[PDB]
Design a protein around this nucleic acid. Structure first.
Length: 114
DNA sequence: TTTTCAACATATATTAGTAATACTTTTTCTGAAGATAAAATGACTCCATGG
């Protein structure tokens, strides 16, 4: 997010959905059930997000929680559209789903990988 | 020489999927004086044979 984040009050507020342990690991652990993703948090605002099977769920959680990020700040802005890029199944379809299509997608380098 | 850097690296935590092994647990599951008595003491007697 390119701005600092105060975690000590973050979990102290959201620790129902969050956890913060100074000893083990520097940042904060966040638990979101809706959708179900764990959000790994730091001081600088660099946020690592996983525990998701779906690309859309990422921007879902990141989106919904970003107002919590703007909530806790010390002294971008516009989400634009919630979903911009094509869905996941589009890029899954960009590759042949048929189990028997291989030699067509064979890189020809695997012919050299023997 | 010493100090600051740096730097290298490596855990550290998440979320998975396995799969397999090893490893701890847990949960069965058994292998003070004067009555009261108990017994040893002893006499009594039934009852044995024999001259």
């Amino acid at each position: 997010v390119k701005f600092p984040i105060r975690l000590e009050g973050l979990a102290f507020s959201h620790g129902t959905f969050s956890s913060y342990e100074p000893e083990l690991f520097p940042g904060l652990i966040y638990r979101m059930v809706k959708p179900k993703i764990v959000l790994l948090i730091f001081v600088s605002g660099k946020i690592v997000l996983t525990g998701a099977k779906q690309r859309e769920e990422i921007y879902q959680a990141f989106e919904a929680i970003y107002p919590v990020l703007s909530e806790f700040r010390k002294m971008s802005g516009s989400p634009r559209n919630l979903h911009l890029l094509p869905t996941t199944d589009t890029y899954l379809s960009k590759v042949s789903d048929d189990p028997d299509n291989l030699e067509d997608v064979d890189d020809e380098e695997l012919n050299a990988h023997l």
